[PDB]
Amino acid sequence: TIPESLDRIKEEFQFLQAQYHSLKLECEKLASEKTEMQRHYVMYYEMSYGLNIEMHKQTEIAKRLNTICAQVIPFLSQEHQQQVAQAVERAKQVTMAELNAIIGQQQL
Amino acid sequence: IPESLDRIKEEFQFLQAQYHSLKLECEKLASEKTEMQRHYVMYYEMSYGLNIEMHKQTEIAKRLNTICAQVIPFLSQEHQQQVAQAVERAKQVTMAELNAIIGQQQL
Amino acid sequence: FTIPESLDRIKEEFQFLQAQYHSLKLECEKLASEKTEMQRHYVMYYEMSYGLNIEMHKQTEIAKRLNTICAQVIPFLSQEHQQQVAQAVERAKQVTMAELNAIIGQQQLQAQ
Amino acid sequence: TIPESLDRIKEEFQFLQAQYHSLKLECEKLASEKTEMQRHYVMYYEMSYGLNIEMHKQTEIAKRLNTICAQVIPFLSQEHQQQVAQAVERAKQVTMAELNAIIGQQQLQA
């Protein structure tokens, strides 16, 4: 009709307007979340890089030390060689037990 | 009257345009946040998985130092000199070396 | 934005307009009746105007004839008497408003 | 439901406009006409009155004249009475032809 159509238009307006509102807040939350996520992302990236360097360094040092020991072993007594062989053998034996054990020692 | 209906129609176009644009931008934002959440997760478990190996290598290193230091006084006086210098040579890493290894590992 | 203050404007103006259309319609609808009354009264008074005209001319001519008669047959009578009749004729052709009022009042109250 | 309703409003508003316009027209024309009929009504009312008066006058005069003619009838000749009675009977008798004729005369006269 005519007086019932004019109310229909305003009703539709209030509804649509509400939609734009909720959408706006919802998108604001997306700005916040995306930003925070970005911060954390870059953070753990830098972590990955910096730790990768260290890991590589320690691997290298270890390799070197093993070279020294392996090339300095024959310059020893037989009874010694028999011992340092297994000593080196277990020095390269590292388990998650010891691992997390010293992890907590590091964090505390 | 007729100059007032067009206010309704035009303002409506204005509003729906706004809502449409905001919808588009918002969907783009969902895609973005989800994508960098994926990236974040990836680099998180990167951090963890690398940290494990790092501490592992550190521990191996300390142990090796222990042996090569405790089997050093059972060594020769002219030899202990060589081995000590060698130990202090091994625990010494400059950026050039690590660079040279990084390049070597990614090909 | 003033979309809600604009939406009710057209409502107000609408019912305003249709109110005017209503009032105008009843006014015109009455105007038809009044007009038909004017017309009817007109045809009545026209018809009666004509019908009365015929009678007026008739009685005019009758009176004329009768005066012609009385004057023409005036000298064919007594000498002392024609001077009386000659006066009766004068007072006859003289009609006063009082007499009129009398005749009308007689004519319309015998109509009841 | 929006772009199909706005045009509906505009359309029916134009409709209403047209309606009121036609009505306004008929109203004006009815004012003019009703005045035209009221005027005629007045004119022929005044005419009715003005003719009524004169008719009544003539009828009264005729009545009196008949009275006189009846009164002096016995004072005339016995041979004449039988003529003047007939004369009066002919006078108070008007046919539509005489009406027609004299109306014609009074008209083409002035």
- E-only strand ranges, D15-69: none
Cβ atoms D28, A18 nearer than 8 A? no
- Sign, CA torsion B50/B52/B58/B61: negative
Helix axes C3-72, D96-109, angle to 10 degrees: 110
d(CA C6, CA B68): 92
Which residue among C3, C4, C14 sits closest to A2, beta carbon to beta carbon?
A: C14
The radius of gyration of chain C from alpha carbons, rounded to an integer in Å, stands at: 33
At a CB cut-off of 8 Å and minimum separation 6, what does C10 contact? A6, B1, B4, B5, D9
DSSP A73: S
CB contact under 8 Å between C7 and A6, yes or no, is yes
| Chain centroid, CA C19 distance in Å | 40
Which residues have a C–N gap over 2.5 Å right after them in chain C? none
Q: How many CB atoms lie within 10 A of CB D61?
A: 21
Residue with tokens 């408003």: C97
Angstrom CA distances, A47 to A41, A104, B77, stand at 10, 19, 44
- E-only strand ranges, D24-105: none
Residue A48 burial by CB count (10 A; 0-12/13-18/19+): exposed, middle or buried? buried
Mapping DSSP onto H, E and C, the string for chain B reads: CHHHHHHHHHHHHHHHHHHHHHHHHHHHHHHHHHHHHHHHHHHHHHHHHHHHHHHHHHHHHHHHHHHHHHCCCCCCHHHHHHHHHHHHHHCCCCHHHHHHHHHHHCC
Residue C83, token pair as written in the block: 């001077």
Which chains are adjacent to chain A, needing at least 3 Cβ pairs under 8 Å?
Answer: B, C, D
d(CA D99, CA D106): 11
Cβ atoms A22, B68 nearer than 8 A? no
CB contact under 8 Å between B57 and A55, yes or no, is yes
Going by C-alpha positions, the residue among A19, D13, D10 that lies closest to residue B8 is: D10
Phi, psi (deg, nearest 5) at residue B73: -85, -10
Q: CA of D98, closest CA in chain C: separation in Å? A: 9
Residue with tokens 């008949």: D66
Nearest C-alpha in D relative to C10: D9
Which chains are adjacent to chain B, needing at least 3 Cβ pairs under 8 Å?
Answer: A, C, D
Q: CA of A23, closest CA in chain C: separation in Å? A: 19
At a CB cut-off of 8 Å and minimum separation 6, what does D76 contact? C73, C76, C77, D84
Residue B34 corresponds to which amino acid?
Answer: T
CB contact under 8 Å between A17 and B18, yes or no, is no
- E-only strand ranges, A3-100: none
d(CA A19, CA A29): 15
d(CA A85, CA C25): 120
D16 neighbourhood in chain A, CB within 8 Å: none
CB contact under 8 Å between C59 and D59, yes or no, is yes
| Chain centroid, CA D57 distance in Å | 19
Q: Could you say which residues from 9 to 68 on chain B have a Cβ atom under 8 Å away from some Cβ of chain D? A: 9, 12
Going by C-alpha positions, the residue among D45, D44, D68, D48 that lies closest to residue D56 is: D48
d(CA A60, CA B89): 12
| Elucidation method | X-ray
d(CA D81, CA D67): 15
Helix, strand, or coil here: A74?
coil
d(CA C65, CA D66): 11
Cβ atoms B73, B83 nearer than 8 A? no
Angstrom CA distances, D63 to B3, B4, B76, D15, D68, stand at 81, 82, 187, 70, 9
Going by C-alpha positions, the residue among A37, A36, A51 that lies closest to residue B39 is: A37
Cβ atoms B64, A91 nearer than 8 A? yes
